[PDB]
Structure formats: C-alpha cells, structure tokens
Amino acid sequence: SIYVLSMNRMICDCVSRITGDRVKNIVLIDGAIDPHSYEMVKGDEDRMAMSQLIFCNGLGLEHSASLRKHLEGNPKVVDLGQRLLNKNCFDLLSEEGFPDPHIWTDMRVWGAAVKEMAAALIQQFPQYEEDFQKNADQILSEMEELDRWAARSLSTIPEKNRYLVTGHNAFSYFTRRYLSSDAERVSGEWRSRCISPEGLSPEAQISIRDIMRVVEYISANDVEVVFLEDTLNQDALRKIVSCSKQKIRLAKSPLYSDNVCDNYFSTFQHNVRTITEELGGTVLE
C-alpha cells in the first residue's frame, strides 16, 4: 500500500495515468477551492507524512504559509515548474513581479510537466520503471494529439475576435500559445490578446480602475463575450458587462481556471470548446 501525493487535480490526474493501479494517488486540493490561498486542513500533514512523493506546481502556486512550512526543504517535493525551468522547457510569464503559475493551460508545457512526473516517479520506483514508462508514453502522445487539436480548433477563431476576457489572469500561457501569432510571440504583443479585472491570484482586491480597464479593453477590441470561471467570484465581470454602452454577454459555460471539472483532460477540452465556439470558431472533431 504505497501513497503518492499531488497538490491539485491538474497534477494528480496525470500522475495517476502514469502509475495506474500500482500506487494510491491522493490529492490535497480539489473541488471549488482556490489553490492559490489554500491553507492546510487537519489531516493534510499526515497525507504528506504517509506519502512517498509530493508533486507541486511551483511558480508560487503553493505560496500559503501553511504549505511553505511543509514543502520548502522537503525531500519528497517534486517542483514541476522549477524542473521545467531548469531546462528552459518554457519561458516563464510574470505579472508585476510575481511568477505566473498557470502553465497547465498550455498542453505542450503540461506535456513537458508530465515528462518530469514520469521521470520523477520512475526514479522513486525502479521496480515499476516499465509499466510507468508504457503509461507515460501513452498519455504523452495523447496530450500531443490534444495539443494539435486545440491549436487547430482555436485557429478557426476569426483573428478580429482573438481577445480573451476572463475572471482572473489564468490563461496567459493559453493565449500566448493558441491565440497569438509567431510575430506576437516574439514581440510580446500577444499580451494584447487577454485581459481580466483580477490578477494572478483571486485574493487581490479588484478596484473600479480594474473594472474600467477591462471595460475600455472590451470597447477598444469590440469584444462581444466574456468568460466566467468556476469558483471565482463573478461580481467584477458582471459589473463590467453591465457597464457597457453595445452588445456584450457572458459565455454560456464557465471556464475552469484553477481547478478541474471531472478530469484535467476533459476540462482542457471543455475550455477549448467553450472559447472556440463563443469567439466564433468551429471545433474540430
């Protein structure tokens, strides 16, 4: 009876695919809770204690004082974002001097993350190196196909509509990869393609200036739809919408920014379908 701990479901659902039945995977954070400000609850310390490996996002996602006590200096911790940064697997995004942790919306980056999960798991359990690797090979090639599917579907969004207004800044990596051109990527003008009244963390206070910023962006770019997120307070986007002159609506289905609906993979699919359809594209089969 062996236990491996993942901080959240975006990590846990990939770890569980590599290991299958040969281990018990537990997840610390799930459901409608903000991972950014998660504080450990009773029993969480014991979940870490009984586990063989603790898989973290890094990049400041586990930044609460509770988690920092238990994770900083812990030899069980696999810091997926730091390991990916250790190889320039991706270019870190930031906002006003804090790192952007939301790399799991970019399926190429999260594939690299899963590569580190598999390696880390295999390094801890050489006796499972072979089943682990087989399953890793499978999920990794499924994620590459998922990534191609997303890029192709999101490419059908008319360029005049490639402007993503969300609750907080959880889709910067998504936007840079899937909504922006090579020229916008190299220049950095890809950043014109997404905005949100809240920053990287839902915990920050949203001001009338943030409302106004997003309202002017909506009117400058003729954005017709904005996207609510599951578990994020909806007051700010609802105010932004009401403060229009000028057609503007809420997207039909919510996006999943910091959490998972059924599983991480179906959630990515749902997000891509939702964004593609509402911004005027056509989802590939």
For the chain, the C-alpha Rg in angstroms (whole number) is 19
Which of 4, 18, 23, 48 is in the footprint of Ca ion by CB under 5 A? 48
Q: How many helices (H) and strands (E) does the chain have?
A: 11, 10
CA distance 17 to 24: 11
- The listed partner (Na ion, Ca ion, Fe ion, none) that binds 48, CB under 5 to 8 Å by sort, is Ca ion
> Tokens 């994620």 — which residue?
143
Are 255 and 169 a contacting pair, CB within 8 Å? no
Q: How many residues does the chain have?
A: 285
Contacts (CB under 5 A) with Fe ion, residues 251-270: 258
Residue with Cβ nearer Fe ion (258 or 278): 258
Residues in binding contact with Ca ion, number by CB under 5 A: 2
Examine residue 146 and tell whether it contacts Ca ion (CB under 5 A): no
d(CA 285, CA 184) in angstroms, rounded, equals: 28
Nearest distance in Å: CB 232, Na ion: 18
Q: Which residue, 71 or 93, is less far from Ca ion as judged by CB? A: 71
**Positions in 196-235 near Na ion (CB under 5 A):** 207, 209, 219, 222
Minimum distance from CB of 215 to Ca ion (Å)? 48
Return the number of the residue (53 or 179) whose C-beta is nearest Ca ion: 53
Paired strand residues for 87: none
Distances (CA, A) of 279 to 140, 174, 217, 274: 29, 15, 16, 8
Tell me: does residue 170 bind Fe ion (CB under 5 A): yes
209 binds, among Fe ion, Ca ion, Na ion, none (CB under 5 to 8 A by kind): Na ion
Question: Contact residues for Fe ion (CB under 5 A)?
Answer: 170, 258
